[PDB]
Amino acid sequence: KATDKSFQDKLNANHLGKSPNFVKPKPPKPGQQEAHFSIAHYAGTVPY
Amino acid sequence: VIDSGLVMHQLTCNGVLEGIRICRKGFPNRMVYPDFKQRYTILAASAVPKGFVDAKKVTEAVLGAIQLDANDYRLGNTKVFFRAGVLGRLEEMRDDRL
Amino acid sequence: MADLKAAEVEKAREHFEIYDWEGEGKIDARDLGDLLRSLDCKPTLAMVKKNGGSDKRGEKKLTLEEFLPIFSQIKKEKEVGTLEDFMEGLKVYDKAENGTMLAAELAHVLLSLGERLTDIECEEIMRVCDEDDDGFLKYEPFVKTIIAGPFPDEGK
């Protein structure tokens, strides 16, 4: 039952979320589309 | 303006003291047994089920599902009879309970 | 665990898109009611509001990410009603072993207690169904036409 969407929340909840290179997503709920995470580099930052 | 001399004649004389002595237990609400049995029915899904059930005898559990007090109603044949107070708000409550 | 198969997600996506009225892709928490209904699962408004639904229009806007986690939750509840409970239920009207039901006395039960129907919806019932000379309806064709729906064989 791990439909892609179900995986997003796991990857935020279990021991990332607060780590300095992991950034929080742009809210799905009351939104529209999709589910993701966000990570960082020196050259820029990444929507996942 | 109310006057007590007048009121003392008048409340004796309108059949009032006597006219509480009976009409106290007398019923101010009066409607029909088929609707009221059928509008209530499954309130007692614990007590009344199973194929087919008597014309009269079903009504007690369907009234008394939400407890309902045995003083403040009366069985009748076609017409059903209630009191004031006890009926209406327990009758609103049947939206939240149905 | 439950999720939604081929014809269950295609069904949910079709209907989801059908409800997009503004032209974005959102559905409403009020519209959820007739939407779940359109999916052919039969709730109370109580069952709807239990999984985030509203009286008014435009309070919370729901997405597909919210819609599918509604339907997967909704595929669990077992008591939807049968025919036979309603037989016993609607036998309680009787006084003389007829199985009949006068339209006047029948209007009052539709209006008074519950989620409820209107004066107008009653004028609709009394368009469609079999009265007679005294004016009885009959519980057996009645319940069966309800469960049959809009068009069994005839339909208007």
mmCIF file of all heavy atoms in Angstrom, chain A residues 10-29:
data_model
loop_
_atom_site.group_PDB
_atom_site.id
_atom_site.type_symbol
_atom_site.label_atom_id
_atom_site.label_comp_id
_atom_site.label_asym_id
_atom_site.label_seq_id
_atom_site.Cartn_x
_atom_site.Cartn_y
_atom_site.Cartn_z
ATOM 1 N N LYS A 10 6.550 9.874 5.505
ATOM 2 C CA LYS A 10 7.560 9.044 6.159
ATOM 3 C C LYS A 10 8.940 9.698 6.125
ATOM 4 O O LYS A 10 9.613 9.827 7.148
ATOM 5 C CB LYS A 10 7.673 7.710 5.428
ATOM 6 C CG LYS A 10 6.424 6.849 5.366
ATOM 7 C CD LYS A 10 6.595 5.677 6.307
ATOM 8 C CE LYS A 10 5.664 4.556 5.890
ATOM 9 N NZ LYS A 10 6.129 3.321 6.493
ATOM 10 N N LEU A 11 9.325 10.168 4.936
ATOM 11 C CA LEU A 11 10.630 10.739 4.648
ATOM 12 C C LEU A 11 10.861 12.103 5.299
ATOM 13 O O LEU A 11 12.001 12.537 5.487
ATOM 14 C CB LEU A 11 10.761 10.829 3.135
ATOM 15 C CG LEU A 11 12.141 10.817 2.506
ATOM 16 C CD1 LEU A 11 12.864 9.525 2.844
ATOM 17 C CD2 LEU A 11 12.008 10.933 1.002
ATOM 18 N N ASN A 12 9.773 12.752 5.709
ATOM 19 C CA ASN A 12 9.786 13.969 6.506
ATOM 20 C C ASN A 12 9.781 13.666 7.993
ATOM 21 O O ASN A 12 10.490 14.306 8.774
ATOM 22 C CB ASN A 12 8.529 14.773 6.247
ATOM 23 C CG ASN A 12 8.638 15.753 5.103
ATOM 24 O OD1 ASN A 12 8.825 16.946 5.325
ATOM 25 N ND2 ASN A 12 8.475 15.310 3.860
ATOM 26 N N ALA A 13 8.936 12.711 8.386
ATOM 27 C CA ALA A 13 8.722 12.401 9.785
ATOM 28 C C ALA A 13 9.893 11.688 10.434
ATOM 29 O O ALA A 13 10.357 12.120 11.487
ATOM 30 C CB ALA A 13 7.500 11.509 9.942
ATOM 31 N N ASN A 14 10.438 10.619 9.851
ATOM 32 C CA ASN A 14 11.407 9.784 10.541
ATOM 33 C C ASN A 14 12.819 10.309 10.354
ATOM 34 O O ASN A 14 13.511 9.984 9.385
ATOM 35 C CB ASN A 14 11.290 8.327 10.077
ATOM 36 C CG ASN A 14 9.948 7.682 10.400
ATOM 37 O OD1 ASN A 14 9.006 8.324 10.858
ATOM 38 N ND2 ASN A 14 9.785 6.384 10.193
ATOM 39 N N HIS A 15 13.192 11.250 11.228
ATOM 40 C CA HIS A 15 14.564 11.736 11.388
ATOM 41 C C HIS A 15 15.237 12.550 10.285
ATOM 42 O O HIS A 15 16.467 12.568 10.159
ATOM 43 C CB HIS A 15 15.492 10.620 11.864
ATOM 44 C CG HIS A 15 15.336 10.379 13.351
ATOM 45 N ND1 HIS A 15 15.573 11.237 14.333
ATOM 46 C CD2 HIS A 15 14.916 9.202 13.916
ATOM 47 C CE1 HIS A 15 15.306 10.638 15.469
ATOM 48 N NE2 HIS A 15 14.911 9.416 15.201
ATOM 49 N N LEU A 16 14.433 13.198 9.446
ATOM 50 C CA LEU A 16 14.891 14.346 8.682
ATOM 51 C C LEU A 16 14.075 15.534 9.178
ATOM 52 O O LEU A 16 13.831 15.617 10.388
ATOM 53 C CB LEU A 16 14.725 14.089 7.187
ATOM 54 C CG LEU A 16 15.764 13.192 6.530
ATOM 55 C CD1 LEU A 16 15.212 12.510 5.296
ATOM 56 C CD2 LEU A 16 17.006 13.997 6.208
ATOM 57 N N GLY A 17 13.693 16.528 8.380
ATOM 58 C CA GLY A 17 12.799 17.576 8.849
ATOM 59 C C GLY A 17 13.549 18.687 9.564
ATOM 60 O O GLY A 17 13.407 19.853 9.204
ATOM 61 N N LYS A 18 14.359 18.333 10.567
ATOM 62 C CA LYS A 18 15.187 19.270 11.317
ATOM 63 C C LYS A 18 16.661 19.392 10.935
ATOM 64 O O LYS A 18 17.318 20.362 11.331
ATOM 65 C CB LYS A 18 15.122 18.943 12.799
ATOM 66 C CG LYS A 18 13.872 19.447 13.488
ATOM 67 C CD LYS A 18 14.052 19.174 14.966
ATOM 68 C CE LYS A 18 13.021 19.937 15.772
ATOM 69 N NZ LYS A 18 13.268 19.721 17.180
ATOM 70 N N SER A 19 17.207 18.387 10.245
ATOM 71 C CA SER A 19 18.574 18.438 9.726
ATOM 72 C C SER A 19 18.904 19.566 8.739
ATOM 73 O O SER A 19 18.261 19.690 7.698
ATOM 74 C CB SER A 19 18.969 17.087 9.134
ATOM 75 O OG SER A 19 19.311 16.180 10.174
ATOM 76 N N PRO A 20 19.928 20.405 8.981
ATOM 77 C CA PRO A 20 20.203 21.665 8.271
ATOM 78 C C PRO A 20 20.198 21.754 6.742
ATOM 79 O O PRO A 20 20.173 22.855 6.182
ATOM 80 C CB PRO A 20 21.558 22.059 8.823
ATOM 81 C CG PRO A 20 21.512 21.548 10.236
ATOM 82 C CD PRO A 20 20.943 20.164 10.004
ATOM 83 N N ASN A 21 20.266 20.617 6.035
ATOM 84 C CA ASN A 21 20.215 20.599 4.574
ATOM 85 C C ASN A 21 18.883 20.116 3.995
ATOM 86 O O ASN A 21 18.679 20.144 2.776
ATOM 87 C CB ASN A 21 21.399 19.816 3.963
ATOM 88 C CG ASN A 21 21.551 18.351 4.365
ATOM 89 O OD1 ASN A 21 20.588 17.641 4.656
ATOM 90 N ND2 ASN A 21 22.776 17.842 4.480
ATOM 91 N N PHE A 22 17.979 19.680 4.876
ATOM 92 C CA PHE A 22 16.651 19.235 4.508
ATOM 93 C C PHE A 22 15.710 20.369 4.878
ATOM 94 O O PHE A 22 15.668 20.892 5.993
ATOM 95 C CB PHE A 22 16.268 17.965 5.266
ATOM 96 C CG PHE A 22 14.983 17.297 4.786
ATOM 97 C CD1 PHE A 22 15.052 16.239 3.877
ATOM 98 C CD2 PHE A 22 13.739 17.695 5.293
ATOM 99 C CE1 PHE A 22 13.888 15.560 3.513
ATOM 100 C CE2 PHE A 22 12.580 17.015 4.918
ATOM 101 C CZ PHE A 22 12.654 15.942 4.035
ATOM 102 N N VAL A 23 14.958 20.739 3.850
ATOM 103 C CA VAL A 23 14.039 21.857 3.896
ATOM 104 C C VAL A 23 12.636 21.265 3.804
ATOM 105 O O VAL A 23 12.406 20.179 3.255
ATOM 106 C CB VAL A 23 14.324 22.826 2.711
ATOM 107 C CG1 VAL A 23 13.513 24.110 2.817
ATOM 108 C CG2 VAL A 23 15.802 23.183 2.591
ATOM 109 N N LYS A 24 11.684 21.999 4.376
ATOM 110 C CA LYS A 24 10.293 21.581 4.358
ATOM 111 C C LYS A 24 9.547 21.929 3.069
ATOM 112 O O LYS A 24 9.840 22.959 2.466
ATOM 113 C CB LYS A 24 9.567 22.103 5.593
ATOM 114 C CG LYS A 24 9.835 21.184 6.777
ATOM 115 C CD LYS A 24 8.904 21.520 7.926
ATOM 116 C CE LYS A 24 8.779 20.311 8.838
ATOM 117 N NZ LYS A 24 7.712 20.532 9.796
ATOM 118 N N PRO A 25 8.598 21.098 2.594
ATOM 119 C CA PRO A 25 7.848 21.311 1.357
ATOM 120 C C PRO A 25 6.817 22.440 1.325
ATOM 121 O O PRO A 25 6.456 23.041 2.336
ATOM 122 C CB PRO A 25 7.209 19.952 1.126
ATOM 123 C CG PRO A 25 6.970 19.425 2.515
ATOM 124 C CD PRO A 25 8.291 19.784 3.162
ATOM 125 N N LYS A 26 6.254 22.628 0.126
ATOM 126 C CA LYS A 26 5.359 23.746 -0.152
ATOM 127 C C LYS A 26 3.999 23.076 0.042
ATOM 128 O O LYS A 26 3.701 22.182 -0.755
ATOM 129 C CB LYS A 26 5.523 24.207 -1.619
ATOM 130 C CG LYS A 26 6.957 24.416 -2.125
ATOM 131 C CD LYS A 26 7.012 24.799 -3.610
ATOM 132 C CE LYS A 26 8.457 24.754 -4.119
ATOM 133 N NZ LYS A 26 8.627 25.298 -5.457
ATOM 134 N N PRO A 27 3.152 23.389 1.033
ATOM 135 C CA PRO A 27 2.018 22.557 1.458
ATOM 136 C C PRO A 27 1.071 21.921 0.431
ATOM 137 O O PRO A 27 0.445 22.642 -0.345
ATOM 138 C CB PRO A 27 1.275 23.481 2.405
ATOM 139 C CG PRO A 27 2.390 24.282 3.030
ATOM 140 C CD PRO A 27 3.213 24.626 1.802
ATOM 141 N N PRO A 28 0.926 20.586 0.369
ATOM 142 C CA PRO A 28 -0.087 19.919 -0.450
ATOM 143 C C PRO A 28 -1.525 20.197 -0.013
ATOM 144 O O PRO A 28 -2.394 20.497 -0.829
ATOM 145 C CB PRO A 28 0.289 18.450 -0.327
ATOM 146 C CG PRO A 28 1.015 18.354 0.994
ATOM 147 C CD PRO A 28 1.850 19.622 0.961
ATOM 148 N N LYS A 29 -1.778 20.213 1.296
ATOM 149 C CA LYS A 29 -3.123 20.307 1.835
ATOM 150 C C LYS A 29 -3.659 21.742 1.772
ATOM 151 O O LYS A 29 -2.906 22.712 1.862
ATOM 152 C CB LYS A 29 -3.141 19.652 3.223
ATOM 153 C CG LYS A 29 -2.961 18.140 3.057
ATOM 154 C CD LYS A 29 -3.197 17.316 4.318
ATOM 155 C CE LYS A 29 -3.484 15.885 3.872
ATOM 156 N NZ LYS A 29 -3.970 15.047 4.958
#
